[model samples]
Target: AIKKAHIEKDFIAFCSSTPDNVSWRHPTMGSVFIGRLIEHMQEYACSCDVEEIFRKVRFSFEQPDGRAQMPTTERVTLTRCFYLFPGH
Candidate 1:
């Protein structure tokens, strides 16, 4: 049965659509890129196994205002942007 099958993580990945286009100077472009990435992943999930599909649907964002106070336990807040897939 489809539900009984375990899907491998290696099948999933991402690629930039505009290799030559640069968005480093435009902050909003980053958000647009992220949205497109998520949309592509969602489309890819349709043929994947249930577990694999869930693993692919994940994202997070963090942007701190310069004036905001930092956490007491941490001296500085370092922003991070990355993807995670368990066991892969």
Candidate 2:
């Protein structure tokens, strides 16, 4: 998992994968896109309640012919995080 802090908003944000074995080949692109998408969602909220945000992002693997194919695609959802402690 990798985390980035939004200094202006004072939010501690982090992203992780369900199958933690999935490796991030292109760190720069991944981080940039995540940051941009989050910024866009934050902007869009000004106009509406911002119920939920969902996106289908793809990552590809290189082939012998110098072409890349998406071996796997993932549906990512982002929303407000909640904290709940153990209950009796």
Candidate 3:
């Protein structure tokens, strides 16, 4: 589903994984967030049209008007083109 449309595969994969998929999403914010949603996923969504599924990846970072920010996994170095953020 994520790759079917050819969106940010790596970003989406990482952003939407078990116990940590909620980071990249912001149906209420993926638009401005995608600008923050770096890599190939930046154009993942639009300001007024960001989708629910699309919001689950990438990050220039930041979320809706909340005291909390989007979820971020531990910063890890990636050696492959595409790998899980928390495969373990």
Candidate 4:
């Protein structure tokens, strides 16, 4: 755990939804949150850092049709950018 190791600065946490909202599910895709996360990670992981990848994932959740739900990125104390692949 981050608390056990005091590695907060080296850690980042992402949530599927904000505390006050429900995470939506799709009939075929399963979890909407997880679906977008997988899509973005697969698309950008090799080209972007962790934070940027999640930022894009969060952006994809934005909707204007009243189903809007925002993903959360929390406890970001990273000292450096981390890419999924080295030299990416």
Candidate achieving the largest TM-score:
4
Candidate 3: lDDT over CA atoms?
0.36
Per-residue lDDT over 12-42 for candidate 4, one digit per residue giving the tens place of the 0 to 100 score? 9988654334435543445656777888989
TM-score of model number 2: 0.24
How far out, in Å, is residue 74 in model 4?
0.4
Mark the regions of model 3 whose C-alpha exceeds 4 Å error after superposition.
1-63, 75-77, 83-88
Clashing pairs in 2: none
Against the reference, the lDDT scores of all candidates come to 0.37, 0.35, 0.36, 0.75
Model 1 TM: 0.23
Q: What is the lDDT of residue 78 in candidate 3?
A: 30
lDDT of 2 at 76: 23
RMSD per model, one decimal:
15.8, 14.7, 14.1, 5.8
What is the lDDT for 45 in model 3? 33
For candidate 1, give the lDDT of residue 69: 16
lDDT of 4: 0.75
Q: Residue by residue across 1-88, what tens digits does model 3's lDDT show?
A: 3455533332322332323224345644443333444533434333322223234542323344532336434433433433222323
Tell me the lDDT of model 1 at 31.
45
> Sorted by TM-score, highest first, which candidate order results?
4, 2, 1, 3
Candidate with maximal lDDT: 4
